[PDB]
A paper describes a structure:
Peroxiredoxins (Prxs) are highly conserved and abundant enzymes with well-established function in protection against oxidative damage and emerging as regulators of metabolism, signaling, and DNA stability. The studies presented herein focus on the primarily cytosolic isoforms, [name] and Prx2, and the mitochondrial Prx3 isoform. In the reduced state, [name] and Prx2 arrange into decameric, toroidal rings that contain five head-to-tail homodimers, while Prx3 forms dodecamers (six head-to-tail homodimers). An equally important cellular process is the repair and reactivation of the hyperoxidized Prxs by [name].
In order to determine the full decameric Prx-[name] complex, we generated the [name] C83V mutant, selected based on previous studies showing that the decamer of the homologous variant in the bacterial AhpC peroxiredoxin was stabilized. The most important part of this strategy was to convert all of the remaining Cys residues to Ser in [name] molecule (C71S, C173S) except for the CP residue (Cys52), and then to treat this [name] variant with DTNB (Ellman’s reagent) to generate a mixed disulfide at Cys52 (CP-S-TNB). Two 341 kDa toroid-shaped decamers, each composed of five Prx dimers and ten [name] monomers, were within the asymmetric unit. The remaining residues of this predominantly hydrophobic pocket come from [name] (Leu82, Phe96, Val118, Tyr128). The crystal structure of the decameric [name]-[name] complex revealed for the first time an intermolecular interface that increases the size of the binding pocket for the partially unfolded Prx active site loop, which contains the Cys sulfinic acid moiety and Phe50.
Numbering used by the authors:
A (entry chain B), C (entry chain A): 2 to 186
B (entry chain a): 30 to 36, 39 to 137
D (entry chain D): 1 to 181
E (entry chain d): 30 to 137
F (entry chain C): 2 to 188
Write the structure that this text describes.
């Protein structure tokens, strides 16, 4: 499947310290977000030399996910102290800038391992993204090798598509039956 | 010129009772093309295959997964019904199409 | 990782009977396609009631993958006899129509299991897609629950992106060195 | 021993599986659904092969003769129920099966083939296995042919009648009669 | 209209009955044979071509296997015809093993 | 499969004392019969109260199997001494009478176990029949519960059918190839 994350079974729960968008530390769980779709995405490392345009895209367009009643959550193996430092380092100096999404800290590497995206040899997450429905069931697995980023558009397409199918399963009995009277000659 | 899902009874199924839970990517050229073939020659267009599934308390549900273009055509012509062959099926058949979107049908 | 398929390690090899686009049966291996990028995608079942628009999109736009020196290969657990029958059943009757891509037959479910996309209880593949580079290394894992399809555009984006990064690793040593003469005051 | 898990004289291994019924509907059936009837349960390798499926058709054509003997014929292969349906709705003239008077069981997990000991491991398909199961769900007969040789409807009827004959002369009350010496 | 073994294959060939290998015994209903024999004399273009498997041996030897068109073959045999219309489908020695099991020969 | 006997793999070899049709004891092996098809059939017990019509049918019609270059061999768990006694007991007295087929003795019950037809609780063979080709490969498994016998006709049908398919695998390349000259054009 993916280390422990199985399509159609409940997404592995984590409890972890996150840096919320207001700059506070909160202890959140995936189960805290039952009732909402969750886009849970790992990135390798804070404070690398790469323009973090991928993470920023998800933060910038967080409104479009809130409109679809879904929460975007980012994660890496870096401490919450590091996440906070990276947020409060301005982009101009190779930082991240402020965020509209919470950033989860996975220092024990247990969450990365549960979602099957731990690169063992370097002790860091691959570029993994997981879509989890309002009932906490895993619906989608995306995992990219380190050099290739994820599209916010493709992520929205998937969330809308899963939600579409979810919605046309709120159905009442038909009130109609076939028989002599309904047959086409 | 028939179907390998329902090769006897063809019914006039009201568009309003068909559950179509899979999003359709329709090429509006093929839709417009079929819309004309429906007005000009109804007997050209096969009937669609709908799955008739009974819930846990015997409630009837009619699922259309196919004839994406044909359905779209009859929808444009704001028709009340579409020619369809019914195939009785199980809640376990439905799980192949919907996965974790499969509802707990009553 | 994904059952046995690990990002950055060589993609699990299969040998399987495929229905080629010419309508013949050939015994192909993933290793046959070293030197080309491979988009290897599973779909659940042949002859379901769904318009198979996803498979057709990949077949229709196979030219765009050939242009990028990559081969698209489809797979399901159905016999090669079934694949052939589905191809030779016209779309108008809920068949597939002719194909520009080979369709791999996985009746022992070993390939589905190796790529970690076997839904055990029904004995069928999830909607899994894998990108494999010219050296046979797995670069990308996509796995969707059954009701949601894959984008040809997003697949091309990933193949171009991996190929871009692959290409800017054909580099010669720099003719240049820093020192007193290169410093900006 | 025996046949993978199917033992003569013990209860036939139960399956639950999706079948294509003769009316063209999908139903979820179990072997246990047919207690009270004799069952002729037969595997064939694959749907949509290039062989004239004359063997399967013979059993379908002569299904009346089995119903007369209060027995149900059931066919099975590892192909999905979707495939069974497609094969039924493909006319014989084009190398299909045509309509059927017997249900066709789908065994995609290959668990049923394995239980009856007729799974050819290397190709992931059933051998030509046939099993006779009595009204009490007990396995009475095992027939397994290599792939190229088919089964006789007549020999199958002979076996069902013979087992039923012996079954019937075991519905006995104590004897009202005694010898004198 | 057109077979689900050879629909997207253009080429129909006149295959001599004497080169087709039919290794599976046929149970022929002589009513259906006699019926087709008439349709062949009256309207040849009614009767589809048979599907034969073209399999290459280990040394490139050609073998043509007919497992289907049991009644059609029997009809052309009765009319002592030299050839039968057939669509050829290239296949592997591993495909052949599904049909013949332990009768599968080591084709050269 | 069947205890140890697998369709398409070589039939389990036995070495056992048999009563030959001439009334002698010989030590035979299944491997002794490579080059011939073998119909190897178990029956439960010698000297039961049943008219042994099944065994006699196979003996009586042994010529028809010899014509098809196949050997019929019977087997049970009874000693060779018992087989001999049963042969030399005339039918009229509930014996077997003389035989045109050899009768194999399986007192260790190893052969019955290998072919997966040992009824553990009574220590006797079910009514098992196995068809084995000229190369010693198992082609067919028939196993009946005790009260139902086997047809000589159905056995011959199977032997002829396997032999038919065997024979159309002794093939030379066709000496025909498709091409311009063989194509049927549009009409």
């Amino acid at each position: 499947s993916s280390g422990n994350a199985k399509i159609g079974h409940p997404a592995p729960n984590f409890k972890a310290t996150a840096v919320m968008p207001d700059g506070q530390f909160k202890d959140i769980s995936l189960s805290d977000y039952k009732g909402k779709y969750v886009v849970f995405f790992f990135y390798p490392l804070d404070f690398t030399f790469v323009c973090p345009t991928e993470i920023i895209a998800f933060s910038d367009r967080a409104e479009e996910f809130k409109k679809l009643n879904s929460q975007v959550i980012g994660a890496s193996v870096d401490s919450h102290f590091v996440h906070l430092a990276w947020v409060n380092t301005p982009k101009k100096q190779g930082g991240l800038g402020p965020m509209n999404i919470p950033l989860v800290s996975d220092p024990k590497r247990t969450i990365a391992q549960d979602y099957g995206v731990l690169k063992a040899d370097e002790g860091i997450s691959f570029r993994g993204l997981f879509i989890i429905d309002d009932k906490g069931i895993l619906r989608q697995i995306t995992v990219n090798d380190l050099p290739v980023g994820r599209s916010v558009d493709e992520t929205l397409r998937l969330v809308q598509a899963f939600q579409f199918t979810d919605k046309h399963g709120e159905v009442s009995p038909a009130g109609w039956k076939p028989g002599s009277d309904t047959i086409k000659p | 010129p028939m179907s390998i899902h329902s090769g006897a009874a063809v019914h006039n199924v009201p568009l309003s009772v068909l559950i179509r839970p899979l999003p359709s990517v329709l090429d509006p050229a093929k839709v417009q093309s079929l819309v004309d073939t429906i007005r000009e020659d109804p007997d050209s267009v096969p009937p669609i295959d709908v799955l008739w599934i009974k819930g846990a308390q015997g409630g009837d549900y009619f699922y259309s997964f196919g004839g994406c273009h044909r359905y779209a055509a009859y929808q444009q012509l704001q028709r009340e019904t579409i020619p369809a062959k019914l195939v009785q099926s199980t809640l376990s058949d439905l799980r192949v199409y919907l996965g974790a979107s499969t509802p707990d049908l009553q």
